Design a protein around this motif. Structure first.
Motif, PDB file in Angstrom:
ATOM      1  N   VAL A 175      10.166  42.004 -16.414  1.00 21.02           N
ATOM      2  CA  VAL A 175       9.569  41.910 -17.633  1.00 21.02           C
ATOM      3  C   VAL A 175      10.266  42.955 -18.479  1.00 21.02           C
ATOM      4  N   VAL A 176      10.702  42.550 -19.437  1.00 24.47           N
ATOM      5  CA  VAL A 176      11.394  43.519 -20.410  1.00 24.47           C
ATOM      6  C   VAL A 176      10.488  43.724 -21.567  1.00 24.47           C
ATOM      7  N   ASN A 177      10.087  44.726 -22.090  1.00 28.05           N
ATOM      8  CA  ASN A 177       9.453  45.324 -23.528  1.00 28.05           C
ATOM      9  C   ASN A 177      10.736  45.601 -24.294  1.00 28.05           C
ATOM     10  N   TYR A 178      11.096  44.420 -24.847  1.00 31.08           N
ATOM     11  CA  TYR A 178      12.186  44.581 -25.835  1.00 31.08           C
ATOM     12  C   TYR A 178      11.778  45.152 -27.072  1.00 31.08           C
ATOM     13  N   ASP A 179      10.330  45.000 -27.601  1.00 26.23           N
ATOM     14  CA  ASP A 179       9.893  45.979 -28.583  1.00 26.23           C
ATOM     15  C   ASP A 179       8.759  46.726 -27.877  1.00 26.23           C
ATOM     16  N   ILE A 180       8.645  48.001 -28.094  1.00 24.23           N
ATOM     17  CA  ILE A 180       7.521  48.928 -27.563  1.00 24.23           C
ATOM     18  C   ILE A 180       6.355  48.440 -28.116  1.00 24.23           C
ATOM     19  N   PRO A 181       5.367  48.055 -27.522  1.00 23.42           N
ATOM     20  CA  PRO A 181       3.880  47.871 -28.354  1.00 23.42           C
ATOM     21  C   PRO A 181       3.277  49.429 -28.721  1.00 23.42           C
ATOM     22  N   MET A 182       2.168  49.215 -29.656  1.00 25.35           N
ATOM     23  CA  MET A 182       1.613  50.310 -30.000  1.00 25.35           C
ATOM     24  C   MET A 182       0.359  50.392 -29.300  1.00 25.35           C
ATOM     25  N   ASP A 183      -0.271  49.346 -28.973  1.00 26.07           N
ATOM     26  CA  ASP A 183      -1.446  49.067 -28.283  1.00 26.07           C
ATOM     27  C   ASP A 183      -0.749  49.184 -26.561  1.00 26.07           C
ATOM     28  N   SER A 184      -1.291  50.393 -26.221  1.00 24.60           N
ATOM     29  CA  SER A 184      -0.554  50.754 -24.958  1.00 24.60           C
ATOM     30  C   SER A 184      -1.370  49.823 -23.604  1.00 24.60           C
ATOM     31  N   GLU A 185      -2.307  49.067 -23.648  1.00 25.04           N
ATOM     32  CA  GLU A 185      -2.704  48.210 -22.819  1.00 25.04           C
ATOM     33  C   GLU A 185      -1.996  46.972 -23.003  1.00 25.04           C
TER      34      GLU A 185
END
Lengths: 227, 218
Positions: free
Chosen positions: A100-110
């Motif tokens: 799993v690649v978080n290519y864009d980091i989320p703001m919602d941490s869940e």
């Protein structure tokens, strides 16, 4: 039950080129690349395709027929990589996914946690890799306390690493060719290939280096010095 | 215009494998393959393409723009082989065609002359090759009679000749890589794979491509 998590600081190259490096750098079965928007899914998909991977975008407003087609093509192996938004990937249980690649980091941490849970969902162990811009350190800290874990930072895989990965997979095709039966007929052609007309010495090692260059795949075994 | 003509009695292999064999055995620039059924227009097509050729059908059901696009792809070199029926090829002209294959024998002399004429244009040298099944020898004799002239029979290019052709082309690619700048970098990688001769033979097998240099008999 476990996911190994790392993150890379976007520094040397753009996210597209880094993604290709990270994908090539270690084994994965299937992968899911999570991005902020649908427009991002298309840019990623086209970078992965002009780099030799079979990938497709899942989007929340896509044709439901194409969704089901795309998801089964991933299951049966016509695809190895999906590029998805949080919206599109809800309801996604696909056991091939090992990366799993978080290519864009989320703001919602869940959103982070639900994203990396698309792997390691079996008894098998999966991996998760997070891209973090220096502008985004705050959201990394957000993630890294929302779960009490510190995410270790990896470097960008270097040329020498990629060359070794390429050599090692090439050597494996070499090995299945040595188990051939007709190998001896090919031995007899080695003398016949070689130019004897202008300056002759049957130089087996120089021939074999020419043959290695012709046998290497599209992924050249001589990776340019940098990075 | 000449245009050397010859014919092959269909024997010992099917027409498709035989066409692939005749194509490999002798240099051609562009080729046109005449067939009778527009199904064959399509099936010979990807028989040629699974042997690595760039080819497209040219039949009466794909017009009129898609025709003229297909011909320009033939003319600028994005295609090297058209498989045509006689209808879809009333209008010529490509000036790259050095080979005409009458894959299906024409039903009469005038048709055979028409098909042949697609090569030998601008007075340059061209070749025609005809396929003749046993049951069709009447049709061939009809063509020969009407035309006042016999068509020489030729053998299938044999396996040894094919091995010689494939070796020649390959050794010329090998020579190029033997004069390339970065070769010593590759030299250093040989020790890292896991004796030279055994490794080089396996590399040869992997470098040769799909046209295997070791041709089995027939």
């Amino acid at each position: 039950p476990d996911i190994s998590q790392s993150y890379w600081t976007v520094w040397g190259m753009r996210k597209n080129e880094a993604l290709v490096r990270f994908l090539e750098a270690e084994d994965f079965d299937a992968a899911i690349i999570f991005v902020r928007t649908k427009n991002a899914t298309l840019e990623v998909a086209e970078a992965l395709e002009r780099n030799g991977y079979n990938s497709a975008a899942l989007n929340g407003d896509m044709n439901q027929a194409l969704r089901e087609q795309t998801l089964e093509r991933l299951k049966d192996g016509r695809l190895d990589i999906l590029i998805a938004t949080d919206v599109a990937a809800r309801g996604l249980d696909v056991e091939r996914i090992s990366l799993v690649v978080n290519y864009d980091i989320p703001m919602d941490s869940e959103s982070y946690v639900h994203r990396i849970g698309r792997t390691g969902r079996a008894g098998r162990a999966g991996r998760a890799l997070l891209f973090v811009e220096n502008r985004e350190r705050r959201l990394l800290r957000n993630i890294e306390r929302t779960m009490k874990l510190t995410i270790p930072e990896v470097e960008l895989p270097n040329a020498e690493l990629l060359g070794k990965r390429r050599l090692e997979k090439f050597a494996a095709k070499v090995q299945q060719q040595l188990e051939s039966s007709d190998l001896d007929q090919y031995r007899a052609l080695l003398s016949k290939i070689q130019p004897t007309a202008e300056g002759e010495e049957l130089d087996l090692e120089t021939l074999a280096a020419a043959l290695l260059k012709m046998a290497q795949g599209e992924r050249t075994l001589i990776v340019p010095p940098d990075a």
